[PDB]
Amino acid sequence: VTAITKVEREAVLVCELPSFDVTDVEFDLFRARESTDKPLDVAAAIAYRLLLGSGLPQKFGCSDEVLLNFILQCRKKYRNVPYHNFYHVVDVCQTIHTFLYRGNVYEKLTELECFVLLITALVHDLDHMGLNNSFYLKTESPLGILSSASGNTSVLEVHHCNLAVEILSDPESDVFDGLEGAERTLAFRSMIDCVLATDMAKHGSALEAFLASAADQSSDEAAFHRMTMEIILKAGDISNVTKPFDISRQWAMAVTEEFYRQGDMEKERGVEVLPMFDRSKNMELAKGQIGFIDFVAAPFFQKIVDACLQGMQWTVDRIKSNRAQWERVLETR
Ligand SMILES: [Mg+2]
Ligand SMILES: [Zn+2]
């Protein structure tokens, strides 16, 4: 891949982020994007400050320059789609920072694992096209065919991992270059395991495995660490409903539009369109959010908090509160 220039680095370094506390659970990435005409540079600055403020890169021999190169190599590989763009992965990164440090989940992990998590947030959707795994499989796209033939259905997640590995092979953007031996292996394997675990087809089993391990005082420690990392990256990925209502609503709109574009492309392809992905059918953002809250997000956050992650109780509170607010939208319609 092409090297990062001093001009690119400087365009990020000049962003000063006045008024913003990036470590805060109420942090608003949408408001940060509007605040300049260089939203991509602000987003990179947010990531850079999060990682530096953690104190972690320094401890693992990752210089400020390599860190920022990495951030910019990641940014290059995100596309202009409505939801799975660079702002999403910076959001996931920021949210995971709150789960670790505001939610005290850092206590369950080594410093290396915290570092790997914040880094993995930035790589976990690399080169997403706004199309889900199902699109590629249903349409018999070349990547779908390769995934079927090679035995994995996680088309996107494997692709994201490939691109992460390519970014890290260049020592100028290898945030893990200061590691050796078992630590270096652990960083790569845990990053990869986490990305593969974000495939929502694996949602139920990843959750159950985490909960089984957390309830077992004799669980293998290394396995529990690994599952905690997986569940935190997953938690970040479905954390939209845990944010202040208006932030949550803006996310929901962005995802809804991405899905609608997938459904438009499925129509042109002559393949099946699910109701959720079909523009022609929906009227109700509130019912979708309530549905998602009830069947996916609230049980997930409730169960992991009760099992183990007590410090993240606010996620459950905000989901409750956001749901009540969507019920008010319905009641007054
Ligand atoms: Mg993904
Ligand atoms: Zn994601």
Alpha carbon of 73 to those of 70, 87, 89, 173, 255: distances in Å?
5, 15, 13, 7, 24
Backbone φ and ψ of 185, nearest 5°: -55, -45
Proximal ligand: closest to the CA of 130: 1
Binding residues: 84-88, 124-125, 157, 237, 289
Ligand 1 centroid to Cα of residue 202, in Å, is 12
Ligand 1 centroid to Cα of residue 157, in Å, is 6
Is the Cβ–Cβ distance between 4 and 170 less than 8 Å?
Answer: no
Catalytic annotation present for 84: yes
CB atoms within 5 A of ion ligand 1 belong to 125, 198
Proximal ligand: closest to the CA of 121: 2
- Please name the residue that has the structure tokens 């099992």: 307
The Cα–Cα gap between 247 and 30 comes to 7
Proximal ligand: closest to the CA of 237: 2
The Cα–Cα gap between 104 and 262 comes to 38
Which class for 10: exposed (0-12), middle (13-18), buried (19 or more C-beta within 10 A)? Answer: exposed
| Domains within the chain, CATH numbers bracketed | 1-333 (1.10.1300.10)
Alpha carbon of 183 to those of 68, 80, 87, 178, 240: distances in Å?
22, 35, 29, 10, 32
Q: What is the resolution of this structure in A?
A: 2.1
User: Is the alpha carbon torsion for 315, 320, 325, 326 positive or negative?
Assistant: positive
- Please name the residue that has the structure tokens 């909960």: 211
> What Rg do the C-alpha atoms of the chain give, in angstroms?
20
End-to-end CA distance of the chain: 52
Ligand 1 centroid to Cα of residue 332, in Å, is 35
**Angle between helix 181-196 and 221-237 (nearest 10):** 40
Ligand 1 centroid to Cα of residue 124, in Å, is 6
Nearest to 305 by CA among 293, 318, 316, 296: 316
Binding residues for Zn(2+): 88, 124-125, 237
Please name the method used to determine this structure: X-ray
Binding residues for Mg(2+): 125, 157
Ligand 2 centroid to Cα of residue 331, in Å, is 32
Q: Distance from CA of residue 255 to its chain's centroid?
A: 13
The Cα–Cα gap between 179 and 146 comes to 33
- Bin 303: left if φ > 0, else alpha if -120 < ψ < 50, else beta: alpha
Binding residues for AMP: 84-88, 125, 237, 289
Q: Distance from CA of residue 248 to its chain's centroid?
A: 15
| Per-residue three-class SS string for the chain | CCCCCHHHHHHHHCCCCCCCCCCCCCCCHHHHHHCCCCHHHHHHHHHHHHHHHCCHHHHCCCCHHHHHHHHHHHHHCCCCCCCCCHHHHHHHHHHHHHHHHCCCHHHHCCHHHHHHHHHHHHHCCCCCCCCCHHHHHHCCCHHHHHHHHCCCCCHHHHHHHHHHHHHHHCHHHCCCCCCCHHHHHHHHHHHHHHHHCCCHHHHHHHHHHHHHHHHCCCCCHHHHHHHHHHHHHHHHHCCHHHCCHHHHHHHHHHHHHHHHHHHHHHHHHCCCCCHHHCCCCCCCHHHHHHHHHHHHHHHHHHHHHHHCCHHHHHHHHHHHHHHHHHHHHHHCC
The Cα–Cα gap between 295 and 220 comes to 30
Nearest 5 degrees, angle CA 277-CA 281-CA 286? 80
- Please name the residue that has the structure tokens 């365009």: 11
- Bin 100: left if φ > 0, else alpha if -120 < ψ < 50, else beta: alpha
Q: How many other CB atoms are there within 10 angstroms of residue 298's CB atom?
A: 20
Ligand 1 centroid to Cα of residue 198, in Å, is 6
The Cα–Cα gap between 177 and 174 comes to 5
The Cα–Cα gap between 80 and 215 comes to 42
The Cα–Cα gap between 274 and 95 comes to 30
- Bin 152: left if φ > 0, else alpha if -120 < ψ < 50, else beta: beta
- Please name the residue that has the structure tokens 């998602």: 292
Q: Which two tokens stand for residue 133?
A: 């795994």
Alpha carbon of 211 to those of 176, 217, 252: distances in Å?
30, 12, 28
Select which of 84, 159, 160, 225 is catalytic: 84
Count, residues in the chain: 333
Is the Cβ–Cβ distance between 211 and 304 less than 8 Å?
Answer: yes
Nearest 5 degrees, angle CA 141-CA 142-CA 148? 90
Q: Which two tokens stand for residue 162?
A: 């490939």
Is the Cβ–Cβ distance between 164 and 123 less than 8 Å?
Answer: yes
